[PDB]
Amino acid sequence: CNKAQQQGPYTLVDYQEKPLNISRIQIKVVKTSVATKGLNFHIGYRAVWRGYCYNGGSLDKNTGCYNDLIPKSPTESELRTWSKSQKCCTGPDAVDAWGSDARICWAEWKMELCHTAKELKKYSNNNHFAYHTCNLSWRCGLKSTHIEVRLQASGGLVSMVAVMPNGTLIPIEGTRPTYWTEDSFAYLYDPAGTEKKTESTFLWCFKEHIFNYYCRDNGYYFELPANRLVCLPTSCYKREGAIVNTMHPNTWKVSEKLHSASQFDVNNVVHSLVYETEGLRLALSQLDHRFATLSRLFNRLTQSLAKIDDRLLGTLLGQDVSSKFISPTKFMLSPCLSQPVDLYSFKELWLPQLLDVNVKGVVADEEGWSFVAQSKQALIDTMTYTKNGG
Amino acid sequence: CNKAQQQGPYTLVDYQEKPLNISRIQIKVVKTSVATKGLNFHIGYRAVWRGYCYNGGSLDKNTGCYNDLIPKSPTESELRTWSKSQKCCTGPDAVDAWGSDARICWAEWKMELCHTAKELKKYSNNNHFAYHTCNLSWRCGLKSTHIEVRLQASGGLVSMVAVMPNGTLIPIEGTRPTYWTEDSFAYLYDPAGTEKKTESTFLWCFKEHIFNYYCRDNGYYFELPANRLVCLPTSCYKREGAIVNTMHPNTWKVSEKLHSASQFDVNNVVHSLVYETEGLRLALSQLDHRFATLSRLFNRLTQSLAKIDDRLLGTLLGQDVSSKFISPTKFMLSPCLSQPVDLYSFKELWLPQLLDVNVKGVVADEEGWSFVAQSKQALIDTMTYTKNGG
Amino acid sequence: CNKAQQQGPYTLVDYQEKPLNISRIQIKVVKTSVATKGLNFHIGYRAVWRGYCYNGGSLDKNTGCYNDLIPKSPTESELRTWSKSQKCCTGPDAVDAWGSDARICWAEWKMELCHTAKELKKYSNNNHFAYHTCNLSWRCGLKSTHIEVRLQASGGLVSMVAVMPNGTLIPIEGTRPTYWTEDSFAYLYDPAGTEKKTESTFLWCFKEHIFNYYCRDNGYYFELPANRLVCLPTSCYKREGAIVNTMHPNTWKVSEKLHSASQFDVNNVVHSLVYETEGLRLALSQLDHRFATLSRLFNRLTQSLAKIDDRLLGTLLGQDVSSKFISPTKFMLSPCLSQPVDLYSFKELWLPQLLDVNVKGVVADEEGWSFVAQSKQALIDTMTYTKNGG
Numbered sequence A, B, C: 001c002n003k004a005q006q007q008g009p010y011t012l013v014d015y016q017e018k019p020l021n022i023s024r025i026q027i028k029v030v031k032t033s034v035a036t037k038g039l040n041f042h043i044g045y046r047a048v049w050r051g052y053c054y055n056g057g058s059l060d061k062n063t064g065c066y067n068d069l070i071p072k073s074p075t076e077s078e079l080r081t082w083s084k085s086q087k088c089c090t091g092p093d094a095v096d097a098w099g100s101d102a103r104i105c106w107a108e109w110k111m112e113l114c115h116t117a118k119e120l121k122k123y124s125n126n127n128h129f130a131y132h133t134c135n136l137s138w139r140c141g142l143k144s145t146h147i148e149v150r151l152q153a154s155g156g157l158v159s160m161v162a163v164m165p166n167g168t169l170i171p172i173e174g175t176r177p178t179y180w181t182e183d184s185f186a187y188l189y190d191p192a193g194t195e196k197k198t199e200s201t202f203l204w205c206f207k208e209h210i211f212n213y214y215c216r217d218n219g220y221y222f223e224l225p226a227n228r229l230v231c232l233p234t235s236c237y238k239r240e241g242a243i244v245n246t247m248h249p250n251t252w253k254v255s256e257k258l259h260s261a262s263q264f265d266v267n268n269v270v271h272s273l274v275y276e277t278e279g280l281r282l283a284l285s286q287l288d289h290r291f292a293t294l295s296r297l298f299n300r301l302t303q304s305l306a307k308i309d310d311r312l313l314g315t316l317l318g319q320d321v322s323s324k325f326i327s328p329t330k331f332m333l334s335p336c337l338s339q340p341v342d343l344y345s346f347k348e349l350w351l352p353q354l355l356d357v358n359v360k361g362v363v364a365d366e367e368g369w370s371f372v373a374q375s376k377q378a379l380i381d382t383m384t385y386t387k388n389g390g
């Protein structure tokens, strides 16, 4: 039929997407690393319960008890000797030692007797009239374990520290063993089996103009800005040939290594994952619908060109075949038998990789600090009430 | 060659994808917010170790020691004065005060002497015959910090509460400072610098029929059902013009803010992320293969139409050029020089945004409650054994 | 115009993507499950503070105090009776019972008096000359709660255990109640309401050659290797008809259920999510650009074929219409009115599902173990100093 009507004029419009300047580059970096191996941390503790009484009667002003929990933390020498001996050495215990024996409370003891384990007893009595009564009860303990040295930059210089449960960073060197002491405890770290590198290498990062840079290393994921040193517990990163601002760096917060994450935080991460995957379902389904549309259009146009070129559908199927259309849509089939040019510019589609992610927990749950807290709790448990050993 | 054979009849089928009624809408919401700023929480503690003895001999029934750890929590006035003074004020200490001086144990003390810090000593002795012996040792401490007010709805009314480590929700008002006391401790919060909003705004949510609604705000991600108030620690959300069911709301579980997440929980979230990314790799690779197929088909069909229209490949390349096919596939090139209609209905592809996610930790690790726990632990540490100060 | 120049020869190249042997299969598995329901765990504790003194003067060697905190954990019978009674039963308390009454310190008490709650007092005095002074103060407590039985395989045999805060796995059977005791505490679990299944079923997993297998169940996500039993807290999985290596299995680490995740771990998971979503933005945007390209090419080619077939654009639009091109691009419109063959091989696009993920926290925050720790802390709080009750 058709008309002399010419209700136009029309012109096909191309689909134009909103551009995105995102791309996956290699970024050259100076990377300062640190790794530790083997039993490199040794913790010892030792203390004496000394209860020294005198019984001169209610009338004597010297009657009474002077007690004390004397801390006797081991020396570096003694802590090493314990470390190879697997025993903590100690002085003598004394129960109900009165009169001349009570002087054992004031002798400079030799730490002779060594133990697999030793807890003290809160002994005290004063029932020997006109005499002194001495009670002496020792406790000691030792654990050898593996500590993880971490990094920190202050003044622009990356140095090694050991984080303690209360947040104090213990400066650590890499040649000589570091040894320190708090009250009853003595700690010894030896830098053997520990390595601190500085390395010219590369990182696979996503550059995306708001440019931001989203980078990955081993199990760490982090933004890597320009002219700023990015420090994470065991690795710092700098852009090669870029000038770090001396201080004001991007460094890990020690608090986040001491403090645990709540169940609400992780559930919130799960919910964010759900929201994200909803977005991904939307986008992927939209692309799916697009391929449906292109399928329809390409089919109609294939019908149009095919009625002219009967060898078209054949090469389309890879089958040696010619067609004859008995219908606008239905057709029948019969058989019988340089430079490249790319019209599409399709590039390699980046498939997301499986993410190695580090989960290490809080510092208080490290074996050594757990041992320290356990020791303190045992001391509290055993000082609950005085025991009469006479 | 070809045959009179007509092994058909065939008909091209269009690709039909499984539909998905997912879409990203703006949802109008009434949102109740709350924000806090500055040092708004003040914690003080104060107590007296009073050891009051009398020495009348083994025969006197009055001989012995009455000791007590009297809690003396500061008043709101005294806590404010400490807050501006940066010192905790206290009464007098007394070591080995016997006879007439021992009466200091029973005088109504004036809290005169103020401290940067103060811990008591467990002094006790009774060696003054026919006399009383008084020992008095004070302890006090103060910390000014920043607390985060949270929201809770019971009876349909959204109100402000302060969560304590044991789970108790302290009702908080926004005009007058709230002050309370537990044993030795006194806490003072002032509502200045704190703001509670109610706001008509919008949220970007994913609506997807099983309709569910997956919503995001600041660092919070949450389902927003119909006719139900959704409360999260610092923000509640309601559908505008919808009738909340008075109670039975969707509110955050206080437990999940007090209790930490295990390493197994987070590792499990990581594994779920891995499973998810495997699905995404599958889908994206499938789409990739689809573009390969369309590339092949479009190339063959382009060859078919090009042998008829020699200006086709030119406009395909944007190059001014005509072709001549010396082969079914090989060809040669030479140069020389309204309403819109959209066949594709391609819409803007939603690219997933980078997710702002809140990670705040457990309540016990808040600075103030950490200070309280530290104070209690110090008190335990110093009450381990009696010290004779005579 | 055009030339006798034939600057070729060219040939269209098809887009070839890098293949990926990833696919979503059903894996047949033998799955050992375990579920618990109702109040199935009962915790009781009970202890006696016994301070037994004698006052014979400074001269008598028998003068002094023998004190003790005697643990008296309930029996299985008594713990069950408490469980149904909601009261913990106890012996008699005694304050300042001297002379003949002091013998109550050494009578075999009958646990007659029962309590909603009971804490002891550290009473001690010795002011009755030539007499004994007895102080007796009891404490008891009971909590009924819900414990979650977990699985563990050693020797290839999957068995049920109850994890305790210090990491010890308590072997649990499914018929008779299990009962054990530590110092002051007694615990009773009854296996009623608890179920341990072994089941032939299937899992939806992603098989992807490096083949690895990434699987999901309820809220658990885990790799399921070949010929290895994969144990998770409440469910183990084995490939059907495959031979598990007797031991050396892939089992959950008990530590990760006792130890919490740091805020740095979760923030790191967030950053990994950001990196991932950057990759997804890149890929999705690339596919978008691809559809733009195909839109352009298909439009030009549609113009080429349309000037020959004026019914083409009509069937392309589903509109009954014929075209006439007054321009290389502009055109005008007028109206008036078997086996299937698939050229594309497009398959069902897998849309990622919303991930159910379990977040359970640490074992120490379970209600029962929280109750135990609270009880111990109360005992510590009340033993701080002796109180004279005379």
Ligand SMILES: *[C@@H]1O[C@H](CO)[C@@H](O)[C@H](O)[C@H]1NC(C)=O
Pocket (backbone or CB within 6 Å): A021, A209
């Ligand atoms: C895209 O990125 C390049 C660097 O690769 C930059 O030169 C250009 O300005 C950017 N353009 C836009 C629009 O982001």
Ligand SMILES: *[C@@H]1O[C@H](CO)[C@@H](O)[C@H](O)[C@H]1NC(C)=O
Pocket (backbone or CB within 6 Å): A164, A166, A167, A168, A182
């Ligand atoms: C942390 O502990 C160390 C060692 O006992 C001590 O020197 C330091 O002052 C403590 N710091 C804090 C903030 O508690």
Ligand SMILES: *[C@@H]1O[C@H](CO)[C@@H](O)[C@H](O)[C@H]1NC(C)=O
Pocket (backbone or CB within 6 Å): B021, B209
């Ligand atoms: C799709 O969503 C619309 C609302 O946008 C609703 O009216 C319709 O029933 C839905 N259809 C299906 C099949 O989900």
Ligand SMILES: *[C@@H]1O[C@H](CO)[C@@H](O)[C@H](O)[C@H]1NC(C)=O
Pocket (backbone or CB within 6 Å): B164, B166, B167, B168, B182
């Ligand atoms: C929490 O502590 C407050 C203040 O000491 C107290 O009033 C309340 O009873 C406690 N609640 C619980 C469940 O421990």
Ligand SMILES: *[C@@H]1O[C@H](CO)[C@@H](O)[C@H](O)[C@H]1NC(C)=O
Pocket (backbone or CB within 6 Å): C021, C209
């Ligand atoms: C692809 O997977 C099949 C099993 O489905 C396997 O037989 C084949 O070797 C694999 N090929 C490649 C290249 O991965």
Ligand SMILES: *[C@@H]1O[C@H](CO)[C@@H](O)[C@H](O)[C@H]1NC(C)=O
Pocket (backbone or CB within 6 Å): C164, C166, C167, C168, C182
């Ligand atoms: C854990 O506690 C149980 C019960 O008190 C005890 O038998 C076991 O030895 C403890 N194990 C460790 C490693 O502390």
